[PDB]
Design a protein around this ligand. Structure first.
Ligand SMILES: [Mg+2]
Ligand code: NA
Ligand code: NA
Ligand code: NA
Ligand code: NA
Lengths: 10, 480, 943, 99, 10
């Protein structure tokens, strides 16, 4: 498809 | 140099790929979606869970601030149409077995049924043609529900009593279950026309004569099939407890209602708070607000009950839970047969069935005698509320994509009059069990998410895809 | 031999190797007109990217045909297919050629006369020519032994005003710097171990990341043995390179060994020669990506925390279950010491060639070449869950959100096998008549290329540390693959000549390729080439030549693009898969890339014209070329509506066009016996434009990009590589729209285009000093224009470490043009905005991009760079004599020394990527490791 | 009668020369065998290529041999299972194997 | 430590 990122932590 | 060497030797000869080799993919590819990324975003929309304070990912889903470009279902659209439905198209040209064609047409029709509940319109009459029509018109949700319901009727009428030769991971060639799924798919779709007010005379008699025959399915309609090992796990767990870190925590409406009804099912899927050992829920969209009102050290993950994934690994994907089948029967008796005795039957059998799946068998007394007891149901509309709520809980951690469809059709739970911030202020004013408009809300129109966006992959490639509309534009069968 | 009628550039081995690069191409980086050369990163052993006159192959074969002697050389690349989570690059196929064996490079740029080298040449050709025989001095022994260091080049520009926190408040465990301003007071930090906690002054540590890196060290030893006679020659050569780059640990390793024997002999009439070469390499990479990698873990460090103070594993607070931050990130020292990512590669190549002259005016040449490789990848990562999850804060105390779940460990191993056989069978005819000269050439080409691998992976490791396919209680995964294509063509090249003044050339070739549908294998592509030396009193005009050419360069398809396939079922889901078998049932699915047997061959047409002149006995020289390239009917898996059954269909595309200008000017202002000063200026400007992708599939196709995020396309009207990204909503008047309640911008209804990948123009400026035996050469590389994605900016933004995020001294602000959309039923009304981004939500305003939102992280591709510096001392012969030495040249050098970048770019050397040395690499840089400064010494000793 | 006659073709080539200070040998051998068991199941293909050369200037001599060797085999497996021979001996004396 | 043959049919 189109590759997914990931948000981090805070 | 022999040139005739251009046959891809990493895949079998097409001649050899027969219908029983393809058909098992339909069931799984569907479940890849309905139990995977779709089940996810429906979960937020139906207000079961929420974004953990100490992480970000589903922010734009809980605050409704995603757009058509966020591709929030492009993946599952590819699976549903280029995975399941094509293989379903192949099976139907590769096997003349009316029992196999029948179960393919049901899995075919179940896919379309989900597409339609997501963007109302869906390609249909022109889909699944190759180069011969790369840009297929998006038929309308009413046309699709119609067409596929006709595909099931034509196909049921073709059964000649012979059995299946295809590997069935769902009902293991037990036709009389597949007929059951079919009727249940009809019951669910028929109730939508009615409450959407289209041909509601016929469909009220078609539901009557359906529920009368009780030719439904036993148990749940599912894919029990997964394993706790890479690439073999329940699609929702694999994505969120493996591919990502823990992101979900329990929402204010679900924790309240369970906690006010004395429901012991509050422990199946919801862990107590790692800080003070009670069940705490987070107001929809409120991650960024709650942290602004309390400290920053005072709304961490320890302050809210996290969703438990322990049970996720092997947990099957469900297409039609039993508990929900009953709750649809108990709705039909209740409001189209005037049969308050047989509604109470199905209503309890609903509540009881779900208490079985979660492992609290023999405990329905907890709510079947206190609070959610059918006695205390005063109005014959206080009852539908009782049926409609218990269906909401019946589907938690089971079939979210419906729990968001049944929340849209029967617009129950009620949307709470009070804003998120007001409920945070004086919780007193909150009716337990009522949705809450997300604290942040990208919807220029307010109110709750009524649909998913069109696939970006279909926006860029199909000139005929409908124009983008905000999240508050309802689907063809939600009219309030 | 300047009968050539299209642009081309020659270089001399000495120039190639003087920069002492471990590679042949990265030295000519900014030095030749219309040869775009960029290494993927400063990680040792990585790939280099060489694209000539624009991207033409919309995916993804744009390297030029490297040809050694003159057998095509394998230029295969070995980088990761998942740059977002496991990033690495292990090499370019040509990285294995030993620069000290180069005698003459000649880059043919023209797509018009290519029939000698076939279809691959439409990307340009890099003709290399290896050093050969003597007699000389001297026993015939050269020795260059070098020693260089490497230092970090650009780190992102940090803020030293606020330390560890989130929302603006103080936190003990954060992975970013949204904390209060720097008191100097003493606060806690880090996890709690055995009822104790560390306690440090809250002050900025401005060098804490700069201090993390060491000084990379690399020794290199080369050696050659040479001699010749009146009927033979013989060259033997060896070379060793051993790099340990600037990241701490052996994690960034590159070892290169080569060997080569090249001999000819004449006995006739008949000549026979043979070049044979062996090339080894062992890379280890410090993986990149969004996961638990070393850089993504490094950048997520508050400004007050001491990195180098985390290495000592005997300090409990640095062990994994008590690391100072749990937020999806691990001690960068522990990552480099316990994760594995290896590659090892053995290769054999060479040629046999049998010249045979006969009947006075004819010659016969047969030339077979073989380029076989075997390469073995090995990666594995600990079972952190079993080692550290129970009973630690990071930990059982982090529930699902622990960085350790579900890292249950993984090990995998892949063995790849490649092999090409090329065969040429030619006959050549060279007869003068009166003042004319006729040179003809007729031949046959044969090419066979095959690749295959066997991959096996194993998850959830039983003994948490040991990496081995027998170390796991769960099912293993197994993959297998092989491609084989073959090609035959017949060709012919005519060369005409008139008193060394006119040079006319006509080429014709016809290929049958195995990758095209059976009823349409054959394609035919001719060409024509004119050279006029209108230079036939002065003594002031040394050389004058004018150039033109009109030619075609057919091309086939990738393998196995015709017939439909039924892959074994598997379903891509976000961050996972569901792959058959299940449970005990296997299954096949209909393949998601629709075949097509109506494909027709690709056809590139080019027009070119040029002009070359010199003056004052070659003390002023310039060369200009204008080109117009059209790559038609390219066979591409073009994107398609998933509702159609497939996700893409293989069809011939339209024209991908590159028009441009290439210009070289060079002069010698001073040239006096003992002292010469040289100037060189080269300028390339190119105009990319996709002209028309098939309409029935829509306008556009994706070349690469994230999901619901910044992706990079190829759109009908536009250049090759248009970006889109989320841009904030504007009223019909100005005017950033913001949320009435939080203050943050409101994403517009679509993604806005935000720029292509291309430089607007590229140029470089070079100068050379010679005084007695002293040499001094300086080369500057200037590339301006375009844009690229940078998670390096993104993550430093998200994290509050980039200087940019000390904007309003983190005081609550109202976005300076903001306005609110006021919707009543159906009426749009904009109000001057009154709601402020509160302090607590300043983080979110930046993490998302600020007022640019997502398009914020498209960075200006543009930089000026101090490419190389080469100080060379050639000892005088008079200093030797009493010694075995026949020449000695001490050399001191430095590469990639300094980089100057607009102003919007405080983040990356723009020369980075995480997506490989070709088209898809122009997408960006997903926390590529820092690029690096290089400098060393080198000792040449002839014998 | 079950067995055919295996066939095998061979081809060799060498190139050779020298001077008073150097020598050069370059060679290529090629074999292809299809043994007497029926079918192509008994196959051997061998290819070699070798280049060897020396050179004296000095005092100093330097030489180098480099060789590449290919082979593709196919073996008509033996054993006690469903293999080809053990299946052949277990044949009655009156049964026609070529039928 | 050894190896098993099998008998045949008859
Ligand atoms: Mg498919
Ligand atoms: Na995998
Ligand atoms: Na190092
Ligand atoms: Na300031
Ligand atoms: Na044989």
């Amino acid at each position: 498809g189109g590759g997914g990122g990931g948000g981090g932590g805070g | 140099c022999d040139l005739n060497i251009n046959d891809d030797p990493n895949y079998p000869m097409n001649d050899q790929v027969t219908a029983d080799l393809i058909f098992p993919s339909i069931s799984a590819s569907i479940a890849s979606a309905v139990g995977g990324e779709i089940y996810n975003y429906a979960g937020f929309f139906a207000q079961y869970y929420e974004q953990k304070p100490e992480s970000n990912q589903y922010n734009t889903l809980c605050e409704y601030t995603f757009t058509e470009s966020s591709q929030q279902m492009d993946y599952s659209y590819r699976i549903l149409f280029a995975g399941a439905l094509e293989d379903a198209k192949q099976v139907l040209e590769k096997t003349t077995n009316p029992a196999d064609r029948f179960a393919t047409t049901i899995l075919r029709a179940y896919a379309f049924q989900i597409m339609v509940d997501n963007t109302s319109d869906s390609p249909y009459s022109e889909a699944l043609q190759g180069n011969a029509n790369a840009t297929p018109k998006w038929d309308t949700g009413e046309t699709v529900y119609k067409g596929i319901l006709g595909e099931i009727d034509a196909a049921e009428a073709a059964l000649d009593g012979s059995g299946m030769d295809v590997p069935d991971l769902i009902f293991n060639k037990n036709i009389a279950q597949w007929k059951g799924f079919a009727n249940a798919l009809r019951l669910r779709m028929y109730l939508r026309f009615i409450d959407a007010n289209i041909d509601a005379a016929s469909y009220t008699e078609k539901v009557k004569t359906l529920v009368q025959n009780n030719e439904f399915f036993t148990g749940d309609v599912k894919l029990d099939c997964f394993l706790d090992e890479t690439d073999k796990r329940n699609p929702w767990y694999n994505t969120n407890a493996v591919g990502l870190t823990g992101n979900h925590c329990a929402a204010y409406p679900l924790v309240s209602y369970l906690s006010s009804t004395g429901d012991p099912r509050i422990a199946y899927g919801i862990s107590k708070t790692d800080a003070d050992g009670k069940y705490v829920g987070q107001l929809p969209g409120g991650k960024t607000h709650m942290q602004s009102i309390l400290g920053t050290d005072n709304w961490k993950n320890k302050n809210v009950s996290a969703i438990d994934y322990s049970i996720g690994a092997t947990k099957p994907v469900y297409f039609f839970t039993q508990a929900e089948l009953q709750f649809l029967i108990a709705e039909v008796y209740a409001r189209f047969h005037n049969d308050d005795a047989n509604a109470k039957s199905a209503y309890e059998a609903g509540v009881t069935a779900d208490f079985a799946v979660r492992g609290f068998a023999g405990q329905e007394n907890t709510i079947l005698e206190g609070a959610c007891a059918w006695s205390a149901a005063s109005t014959q509309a206080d009852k539908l509320n009782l049926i409609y709520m218990q269906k909401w809980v019946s589907l938690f951690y089971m079939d979210h994509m419906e729990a968001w469809s049944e929340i849209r059709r029967t617009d129950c739970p009620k949307l709470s009059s009070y804003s998120a911030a007001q409920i945070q202020a004086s919780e007193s004013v909150y009716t337990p069990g009522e949705l809450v408009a997300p604290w942040t809300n990208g919807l220029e129109a307010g109110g709750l998410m009524k649909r998913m966006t069109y696939p970006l992959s279909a926006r860029q490639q199909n000139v005929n895809t409908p124009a983008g509309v905000p999240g508050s534009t309802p689907v063809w069968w939600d009219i309030k | 031999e300047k009968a050539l009628g299209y642009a081309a550039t020659s270089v001399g081995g000495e120039k190639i190797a003087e920069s002492r690069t471990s590679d042949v191409m990265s030295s000519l980086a900014g030095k030749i007109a219309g040869v775009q050369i960029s290494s993927t990163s400063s990680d040792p052993g990585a790939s280099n990217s060489v694209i000539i006159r624009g991207v033409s192959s919309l995916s993804g074969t744009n390297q030029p045909l490297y040809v050694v002697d003159g057998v095509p050389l394998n230029n295969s690349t070995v980088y990761s297919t998942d740059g977002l989570n496991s990033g690495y690059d292990f090499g370019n196929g040509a990285n294995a050629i030993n620069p000290d064996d180069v005698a003459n490079m000649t880059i043919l740029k023209g797509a018009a006369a290519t029939a000698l080298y076939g279809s691959r040449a439409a990307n340009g050709v890099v003709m290399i020519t290896t050093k050969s025989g003597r007699k000389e001095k001297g026993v015939g022994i050269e020795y260059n032994g070098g020693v260089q260091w490497s230092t970090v080049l650009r780190l992102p520009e940090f803020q030293n005003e606020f330390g560890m926190g989130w929302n603006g408040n103080h936190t003990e465990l954060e992975n970013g710097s949204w904390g209060p301003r720097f008191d100097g007071s003493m606060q806690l930090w880090g996890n709690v171990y055995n009822n104790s906690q560390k306690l440090k002054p809250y002050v900025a540590m401005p060098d804490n990341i700069k201090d993390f890196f060491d000084a990379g060290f690399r020794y290199s030893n080369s050696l050659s043995f040479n001699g010749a006679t009146d009927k033979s020659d013989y060259y033997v050569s060896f070379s060793q390179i051993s790099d340990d780059g600037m990241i701490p640990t052996d994690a960034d390793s590159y070892d290169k060994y080569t060997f080569s024997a090249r001999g000819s002999h004449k006995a006739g009439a008949l000549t026979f020669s043979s070049s044979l070469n062996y090339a080894y390499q062992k890379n280890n990479f410090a993986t990149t990506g969004q996961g638990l990698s070393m850089l993504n873990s490094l950048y997520q460090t508050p400004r007050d925390i001491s990195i180098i103070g985390l290495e000592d594993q005997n300090d409990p607070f640095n062990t994994p279950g008590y690391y100072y931050t749990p937020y999806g990130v691990m001690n960068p020292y522990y990552i480099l010491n316990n994760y594995l990512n290896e590659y090892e590669s053995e290769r054999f190549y060479g040629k046999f060639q049998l010249d045979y002259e006969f009947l006075k005016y004819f010659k016969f040449t047969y030339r077979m070449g073989l380029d076989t490789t075997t390469g073995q990848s090995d990666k594995g990562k600990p079972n952190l869950y079993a080692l550290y999850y129970e009973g630690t804060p990071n930990g059982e105390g982090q529930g699902s959100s622990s960085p350790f779940s579900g890292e249950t460990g993984q090990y995998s191993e892949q063995i790849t096998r490649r092999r090409e056989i090329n065969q040429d069978i030619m006959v050549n005819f060279n007869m003068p008549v009166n003042d004319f000269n006729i040179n003809a050439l007729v031949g046959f080409n044969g090419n066979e290329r095959k690749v295959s691998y066997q991959y096996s992976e194993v998850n959830d490791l039983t003994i948490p540390t040991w990496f081995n396919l027998k170390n796991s209680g769960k099912t293993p995964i197994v993959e297998q693959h092989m491609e084989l294509r073959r090609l035959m063509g017949v060709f012919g090249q005519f060369e005409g000549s008139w008193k060394n003044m006119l040079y006319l050339t006509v080429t014709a070739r016809n290929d049958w390729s195995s990758t095209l549908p059976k009823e349409n294998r054959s394609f035919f592509y001719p060409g024509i080439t004119g050279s006029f030396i209108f230079s036939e009193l002065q003594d002031v005009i040394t050389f004058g030549k004018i150039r033109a050419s009109w030619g075609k360069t057919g091309n086939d398809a990738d393998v196995y693009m015709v017939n439909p396939v039924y892959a074994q079922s598997s379903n891509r889901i976000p961050f996972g898969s569901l792959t058959f078998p299940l449970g005990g049932v296997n299954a096949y699915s209909a393949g998601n890339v629709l075949g097509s047997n109506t494909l027709s061959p690709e056809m590139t047409t080019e027009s070119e014209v040029g002009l070359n002149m010199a003056f004052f006995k070659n003390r002023l020289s310039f060369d200009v070329s204008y080109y117009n390239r059209n790559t038609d009917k390219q066979i591409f898996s073009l994107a398609m509506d998933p509702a159609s059954g497939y996700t893409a269909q293989n069809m011939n595309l339209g024209k991908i066009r590159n028009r441009g200008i290439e210009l070289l000017i060079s002069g010698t202002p001073i040239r006096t016996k003992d002292f010469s000063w040289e100037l060189t200026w080269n300028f390339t400007k190119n105009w990319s434009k996709v002209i028309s992708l098939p309409e029935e599939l829509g306008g556009i196709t994706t070349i690469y990009g994230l999901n619901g995020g910044t992706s990079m396309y190829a759109i009908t009207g536009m250049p090759v590589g248009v970006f889109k990204a989320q841009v904030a909503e504007r009223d019909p008047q100005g005017r950033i729209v913001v949320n009435s309640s939080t203050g943050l911008p409101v994403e517009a209804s679509e993604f806005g285009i935000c720029g292509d990948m291309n430089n607007k123009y590229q140029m470089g400026v070079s100068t050379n000093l010679k005084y007695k035996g002293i040499s001094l050469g300086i080369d500057f590389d200037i590339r301006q224009g375009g844009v690229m994605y940078s998670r390096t900016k993104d993550i430093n933004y998200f994290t509050g470490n980039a200087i940019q995020t000390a904007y309003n001294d983190r005081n609550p602000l109202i976005v300076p043009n903001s306005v609110n959309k006021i919707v009543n039923g159906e009426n749009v009304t904009y109000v001057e905005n009154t709601t402020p981004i509160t302090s607590s939500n300043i983080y979110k305003y930046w993490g998302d991009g600020g007022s640019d939102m997502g398009s914020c992280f498209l960075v200006d591709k543009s930089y000026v760079k101090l490419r190389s510096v080469v100080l060379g001392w050639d000892l005088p012969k008079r200093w030797l004599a009493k010694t075995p030495f026949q020449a000695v040249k001490v050399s001191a050098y430095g590469n990639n020394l300094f980089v100057w970048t607009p102003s919007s770019n405080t983040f990356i050397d723009p020369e980075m990527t995480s997506f490989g040395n070709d088209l898809e690499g122009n997408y960006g840089e997903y926390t590529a490791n820092p690029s690096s400064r290089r400098f060393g010494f080198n000792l040449m000793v002839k014998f």
